[PDB]
């Protein structure tokens, strides 16, 4: 189990990093494409930042 713990920890870290792409982080959406299709670069730059 000591080596399986290493493997599982690495896989879990990568999967968590993938999962964390659904957060808005204060923007109006978590999707770049939705922001760019709903707003012009004018104020889309703020959300993308």
């Amino acid at each position: 189990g000591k080596l399986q713990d290493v493997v599982n920890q690495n896989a879990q870290a990568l999967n968590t990093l993938v999962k964390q792409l659904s957060s808005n982080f204060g923007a109006i959406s978590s999707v770049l494409n939705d922001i760019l299709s709903r707003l012009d670069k004018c104020e889309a730059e703020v959300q993308i930042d």
């Binding site: 012009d40 670069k41 004018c42 104020e43």
Partner: protein, 420 residues
């Protein structure tokens, strides 16, 4: 805390406050053409909007208070309160006349006939939109039809693009072949401006001032006065609207004619071309150098020593000289008496120097001793053997664990708040 334990503490770096303030603006005295722009007898149509360059003038804009009253005045990229303290690089006034209801369309990121087909603004637009009613001027009995707007276009305009073409618009499928008819419209239509219209159908004169700030040489300046230039002193400077604090020194840098500022890789301004005398001045922060405070306990005494790193003591950059000033290799120590003896370290200054509080009572600084200095009688035929021994019990203390901690996110971040 109100009590400080014995030791050495890193305080803030040595700070120098600015002694005075200076302002350096270009040597120009003419007033900007407010009359030719705002007091113009004949404005342009929105579809063919008039762009005028403004250069080499002072933008007081308090001469407009006497007569001009502006229905809308919105500034993007700059606060209205700072316009008197800035210089503007390349200034253009775009003038035209529109309907009252269409003044809202003169803004970044707008849609409508004016925004799409006649006059388009960028969203990276630094400048001020000004609009005021002109019913008494641009409206006459029977309808003033001298002002035109484009009603039909195949595609939206690019920002600051002008389209004066009068080709027939093909709204339908069949070509028009240069003649009007069904689904074949003349693209331009005239405003019907009558003095008895509603305020949303009354003419409005619009001036859009476009400029950049604090990146290039400027010839349009605010009404600020100019102060004599002083060097080699920490000052508050205002160079062409760019404010800051620092020491101004002569420079060996050779600016190209189109450059006004120079920057680090951190984008902070190093060098500036003085707008009055065409010379390059390097700007340096006037706060520099580490400072450390050596103290015994505040319950023991209130005396402290100060170690000024990166100063030499052999007009110093120190808070107070006093006496007992001497130079170590860790910096200049002020407030500690040097002694020729060597003891075990109590407060490590650095670079082999330590300090202590000794008896009358004062802080002393010394070179720490590595230990008792001795030799050993080595020989090719002499040995040393023990005839006795001791049983010694020593103590070694080792941490094993620490406190186990759990955190409730919802309660630390959002304590007893449901919406949170």
């Amino acid at each position: 805390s109100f009590t400080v334990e014995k030791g050495i503490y890193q305080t803030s770096n040595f700070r120098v406050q600015p002694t005075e303030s200076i302002v350096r603006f270009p040597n120009i005295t003419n007033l900007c053409p407010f009359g030719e722009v705002f007091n113009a007898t004949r404005f342009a149509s929105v579809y063919a909007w008039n762009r005028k360059r403004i250069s080499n003038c002072v933008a007081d804009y308090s001469v407009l208070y006497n007569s001009a009253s502006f229905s809308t005045f919105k500034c993007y990229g700059v606060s209205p309160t700072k316009l008197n303290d800035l210089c503007f690089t390349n200034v253009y006034a775009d003038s035209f006349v529109i309907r009252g209801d269409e003044v809202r369309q003169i803004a970044p990121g707008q849609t409508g006939k004016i925004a799409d087909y006649n006059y388009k603004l960028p969203c990276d637009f630094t400048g001020c939109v000004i609009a005021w009613n002109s019913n008494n001027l641009d409206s006459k009995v029977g309808g003033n039809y001298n002002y035109l707007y484009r009603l039909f276009r195949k595609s939206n305009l690019k920002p600051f693009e002008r389209d004066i073409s009068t080709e027939i618009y093909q709204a339908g499928s069949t070509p028009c072949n240069g003649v009007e008819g069904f689904n074949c419209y003349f693209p331009l239509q005239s405003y019907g401006f009558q003095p008895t219209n509603g305020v949303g159908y009354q003419p409005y004169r619009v001036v859009v001032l476009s400029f950049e700030l604090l990146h290039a040489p400027a010839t349009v300046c605010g009404p600020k006065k100019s102060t004599n230039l002083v060097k080699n002193k920490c000052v508050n400077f205002n160079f062409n609207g760019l404010t800051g604090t620092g020491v101004l020194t002569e420079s060996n840098k050779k600016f190209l004619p189109f450059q006004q500022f120079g920057r680090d890789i951190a984008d902070t301004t190093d060098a500036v071309r003085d707008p009055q005398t065409l010379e390059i001045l390097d700007i340096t922060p006037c706060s520099f150098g580490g400072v450390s405070v050596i103290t015994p306990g505040t319950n023991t005494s209130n005396q402290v020593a100060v170690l000024y790193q990166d100063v030499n003591c052999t007009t110093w950059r120190v808070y107070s000289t006093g006496s007992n000033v001497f130079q170590t290799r860790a910096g200049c120590l002020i407030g500690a008496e040097h002694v020729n003896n060597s003891y075990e370290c109590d407060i490590p200054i650095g670079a082999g120097i330590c300090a202590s509080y000794q008896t009358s009572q004062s802080i002393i600084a010394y070179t720490m001793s590595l230990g008792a200095e001795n030799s050993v009688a080595y020989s090719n035929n002499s040995i040393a053997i023990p005839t006795n021994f001791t049983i010694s019990v020593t103590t070694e203390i080792l941490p094993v664990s620490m406190t186990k901690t759990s955190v409730d996110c919802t309660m630390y971040i959002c304590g007893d708040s449901t919406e949170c």
